């Protein structure tokens, strides 16, 4: 009953952000902050009232909250929302990152920031709708609707230093990748719906009804492949990753676009929620290909991150490597690896958010992103290099941060299933330590390699320090006490794992 408001509060808030700009140019940021705070408060209230820790695995479907409204009854299409533990964690993370994205764009007081905040809230509402929709048409609709404000934000509000043509090219490449892969997923959805209609005789896009769809081997493989192509584009999975460092490099310099609709792992959620339960046998046969794609993603992303001279592209390739770990975890069929994947998704969201916010602040201070033009920045800044050191320590999987808990539970479950892939992935952890130390030494240690890095720089303000330290506290708490997060997602992950291994 609150799930429609979880989607609608961002949309009404973005409309109010656009509408309240006539009252003043410092007004829409407050409207966006109240909007995202209300969304986060509703998500936290759903967390408190859900009783997820005491919920046991009863089998798919099992929803803690549900909402249904007819939308297109001709095709059996409904606004059908449902929340359980995994989607609840994703929605809470979306609300927190949306609050951080609003707070990070606080100083942008330009003449059209009402449209900026409207696009940000529309992206966040689309992401929440992706996490909530259990109607396949509605899920696809949210999946494709949240890319238009993404395109416009990158194209018009993006990196001001670069030429407009570069921003247009990166935005267009991202949009073509995501929307073409979404259309392939729509083809798979339509063919699954038609197979179900031929088997039974009713029109349904409901994910609960489409679970019990008898189909031959080969049809199921193709439907799985369409779903996986969409998810692999947005995860990213190599070689469908090239849009991501380009989109990150041309995103708005503060990084609200980075937090709002890139660092929320809708594709891993889609693989767990839709790909494994709808096509369990096809996913079981596809598992070696997906795991080797994850291994290639880990090492390729690590090597790409090391070779970068831009910090933003470096962090984007770190995202590629960590999503390779998550992709390995998803196809194991192990409960421990799935819980590690959930922890890894949340921790990677937090740590990459901290990294991107710190990079935006560093670019505000020194007006460049090339690491060859900096060095020795530890002696010139007050807070930024130490917090960057903490977050780089987090992305190499140091214990005490949630990233270690995530990928080590992933590797424990994966070794219980697939040992060779696991040992190669742990050498991927060595590669991760290499690229994190390389970025730290190129940016903040050594001597100044240009003139901008040789002078004292203004320190972080109270707001930026507050949000970075909140991310630090959350990452440390996830590293040392991950049990509430594991208890929240335990029932949903167990349902997905039991469905995957009991139908194969």
């Amino acid at each position: 009953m609150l799930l429609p408001w979880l989607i609608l509060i961002p949309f009404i808030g973005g409309f109010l952000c656009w509408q309240t700009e006539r009252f003043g140019v410092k007004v829409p940021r407050w409207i966006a902050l109240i909007t995202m705070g209300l969304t986060l408060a509703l998500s936290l209230q759903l967390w408190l009232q859900g009783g997820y820790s005491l919920t046991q695995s009863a089998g798919i479907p099992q929803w803690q909250s549900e909402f249904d409204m007819p939308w297109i009854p001709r095709f059996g299409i409904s606004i059908h929302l449902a929340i359980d533990g995994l989607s609840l964690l994703m929605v809470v993370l979306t609300g927190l990152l949306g609050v951080l994205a609003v707070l990070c764009s606080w100083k942008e007081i330009e003449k059209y920031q009402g449209f900026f905040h409207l696009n940000l809230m529309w992206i966040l509402g689309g992401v929440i709708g992706v996490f909530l929709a259990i109607d396949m048409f509605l899920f696809f609709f949210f999946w494709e609707m949240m890319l238009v404000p993404m395109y416009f934000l990158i194209a018009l509000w993006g990196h001001k230093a670069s030429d407009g043509k570069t921003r247009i090219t990166a935005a267009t490449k991202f949009f073509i990748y995501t929307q073409a892969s979404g259309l392939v997923m729509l083809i798979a959805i339509l063919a699954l719906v038609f197979v179900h209609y031929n088997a039974t005789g009713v029109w349904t896009f409901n994910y609960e009804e489409l679970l019990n769809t008898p189909m031959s081997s080969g049809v199921e493989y193709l439907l799985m492949l369409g779903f996986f192509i969409a998810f692999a584009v947005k995860m990213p999975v190599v070689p469908l990753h090239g849009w991501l460092p380009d989109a990150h490099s041309q995103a708005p310099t503060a990084g609200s676009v980075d937090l709002a609709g890139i660092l929320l792992k809708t594709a891993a959620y889609g693989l767990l929620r839709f790909s494994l339960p709808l096509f369990p046998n096809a996913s079981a046969e596809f598992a070696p290909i997906a795991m080797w794609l994850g291994v290639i993603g880990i090492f390729y992303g690590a090597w790409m991150a090391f070779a970068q001279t831009d910090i933003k592209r470096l962090i984007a390739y770190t995202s590629v490597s960590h999503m390779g770990f998550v992709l390995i975890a998803i196809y194991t069929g192990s409960q421990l690896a799935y819980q590690g994947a959930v922890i890894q998704m949340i921790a990677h969201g937090l740590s990459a958010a901290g990294l991107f916010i710190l990079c935006g602040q560093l670019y505000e201070r020194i007006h460049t992103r090339d690491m060859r033009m900096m060095g020795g920045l530890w002696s010139k800044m007050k807070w930024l290099p130490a917090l960057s050191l903490f977050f780089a320590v987090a992305t190499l999987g140091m214990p005490g941060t949630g990233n270690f808990v995530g990928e080590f539970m992933i590797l424990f479950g994966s070794f219980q299933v697939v040992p060779v892939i696991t040992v190669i992935s742990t050498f991927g952890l060595v590669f991760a330590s290499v690229y994190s130390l390389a970025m730290l030494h190129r940016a903040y240690f050594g001597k100044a390699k240009s003139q901008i890095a040789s002078q004292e720089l203004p320190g972080m303000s109270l707001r930026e320090l507050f949000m970075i330290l909140l991310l630090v506290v959350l990452l440390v708490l996830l590293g040392f006490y991950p049990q509430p997060i594991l208890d929240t997602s335990h029932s949903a992950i167990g349902n997905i794992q039991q469905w995957f291994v009991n139908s194969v």
């Binding site: 609709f141 392939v184 083809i187 339509l190």
Partner: protein, 478 residues
Amino acid sequence: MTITPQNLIALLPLLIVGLTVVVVMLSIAWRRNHFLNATLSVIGLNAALVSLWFVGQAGAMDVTPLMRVDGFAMLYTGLVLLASLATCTFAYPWLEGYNDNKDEFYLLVLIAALGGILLANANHLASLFLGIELISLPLFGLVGYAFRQKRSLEASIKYTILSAAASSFLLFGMALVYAQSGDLSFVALGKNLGDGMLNEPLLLAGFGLMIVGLGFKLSLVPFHLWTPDVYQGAPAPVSTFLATASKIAIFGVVMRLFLYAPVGDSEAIRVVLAIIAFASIIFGNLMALSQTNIKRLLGYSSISHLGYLLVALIALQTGEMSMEAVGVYLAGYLFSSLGAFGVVSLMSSPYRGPDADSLFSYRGLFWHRPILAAVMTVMMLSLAGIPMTLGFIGKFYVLAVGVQAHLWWLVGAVVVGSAIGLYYYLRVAVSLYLHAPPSNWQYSAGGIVVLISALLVLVLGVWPQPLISIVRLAMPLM
């Protein structure tokens, strides 16, 4: 068959548009009055649109061997009348800057709308030929209305020559079909064959020559090369009419011909149309990649969108919702093309000479015309098949129809062409917001028309069920 009073009630929009033609022409003979004659034309078109309600109350019936009136005919009559009303609305502020006679424009638009209504109701090869000609010849006049401009004269010459060639191709194919069949009614084209002898060579050759003529009229590959030149050279309200009403009416009569003719489910014709649809989608999207002219880009876009519609045509006998998909797609395409070409027409109004069709002229449109830029970016999103637009609902219908009939090559073609379309439509829509170096109520009426088109596209993109139910109500005789 004779004509009864109830047949005259089913005749109502055709009779009203013909009476409007006579009345407007007699008013021109009285005195040349641009406002009065434009008002009389739009009053007659509105009266025909209203009388569609009485046509629906009358019911579905055969009016002579030539015409059959049903919900299908009503829907296509309504689409043609909406496009004609929008064309007149965009025509007035453009014609306010025209130094020569302006009153003949509305006469030609009315006669072309009459041809569109005839094609909506056509049940016969005679009525199909006459409706095509009745659309084309007023468009010969309208495309070259500003014949002092070299582009308008060249577009008129090209359209006239190629449409006469296509009409001769279509008439020769009709004659071959008649020689085989002995009846020009749609339901009899292939009826005198049995025991799996539907692929009679003369019948197939006649239908191929008709395919040449109709595929010229629908800008289908390889009869498509006229489209960007005629779209660019024509006056912008004429480009609006040519993009919407002519294409919609000709595709509707093609829909009815392939539904009713027993040779419509021939496998050879199906494969030939599959090749044409594949080539149309791919070629129309690929040629629009590097277009700096908005009218030429919309011409190549029209080629691709008619390819998608033809994909829906191929699954007519296989699936169950091919006609419903075509109706939903054509409503969405009408509204999107009306908005885009109307923004072009309002940017070119009043007429001063060369059309404002360069993409540099639409670069930074938001900083002086923000509402027009918002409408144009909504239409670029709709023609790309982006969700919360009606164009996506049409694309979804096309994809569902193709998936149901297992037309996998066509489905893959739609996906690839959609990606290419995404590139060039996004390029236009984002060039609207970059930085680059009226005052009467008829211009405001044109702006209101494009704004209403944008609102309809957005609202029926979010909530398509009323349009779907309306199209499902408008069903032909089985």
